[PDB]
Write a protein that binds this ligand. Sequence first.
Ligand SMILES: CCCCCCCCCCCC[N+](C)(C)[O-]
Ligand SMILES: CCCCCCCCCCCC[N+](C)(C)[O-]
Ligand SMILES: CCCCCCCCCCCC[N+](C)(C)[O-]
Ligand SMILES: CCCCCCCCCCCC[N+](C)(C)[O-]
Ligand SMILES: CCCCCCCCCCCC[N+](C)(C)[O-]
Ligand SMILES: CCCCCCCCCCCC[N+](C)(C)[O-]
Lengths: 34, 34
Amino acid sequence: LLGDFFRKSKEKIGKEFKRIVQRIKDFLRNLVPR
Amino acid sequence: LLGDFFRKSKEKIGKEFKRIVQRIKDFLRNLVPR
Ligand SMILES: CCCCCCCCCCCC[N+](C)(C)[O-]
Ligand SMILES: CCCCCCCCCCCC[N+](C)(C)[O-]
Ligand SMILES: CCCCCCCCCCCC[N+](C)(C)[O-]
Ligand SMILES: CCCCCCCCCCCC[N+](C)(C)[O-]
Ligand SMILES: CCCCCCCCCCCC[N+](C)(C)[O-]
Ligand SMILES: CCCCCCCCCCCC[N+](C)(C)[O-]
């Protein structure tokens, strides 16, 4: 986002967000399986 | 945001975001001091 500034912070944030999205995906796959 | 889910991730994200905002603040204070 902010150009090439805050590489480290932006990568940590992206990490956690991907973790969250993955767990929400797992949950929805258990809610409506297939 | 997502209720009480993802306490740990949400806290890490908040940490990094506050770091970023603080550094941007410092920068703007050097750009227009007072
Ligand atoms: C108007 C917003 C200005 C954003 C520029 C802030 C520059 C701060 C530089 C901190 C260093 C970040 N770095 C390169 C380690 O990622
Ligand atoms: C203050 C908002 C922070 C935004 C966080 C953006 C996370 C990007 C994670 C790495 C992936 C970015 N990339 C390389 C696809 O552009
Ligand atoms: C609000 C937290 C940060 C949001 C970051 C969103 C990044 C979405 C994933 C980037 C897509 C990269 N990909 C794999 C298509 O190349
Ligand atoms: C429609 C979105 C549904 C979101 C609910 C996902 C539940 C996943 C539970 C993972 C556990 C999270 N916890 C409690 C450790 O923070
Ligand atoms: C996927 C988006 C993540 C949103 C991150 C929200 C960070 C909140 C940081 C802790 C502060 C929240 N609080 C307690 C003021 O509500
Ligand atoms: C996109 C990354 C997450 C953004 C989190 C934004 C939180 C702003 C700070 C919350 C304000 C809490 N306070 C100190 C007024 O009580």
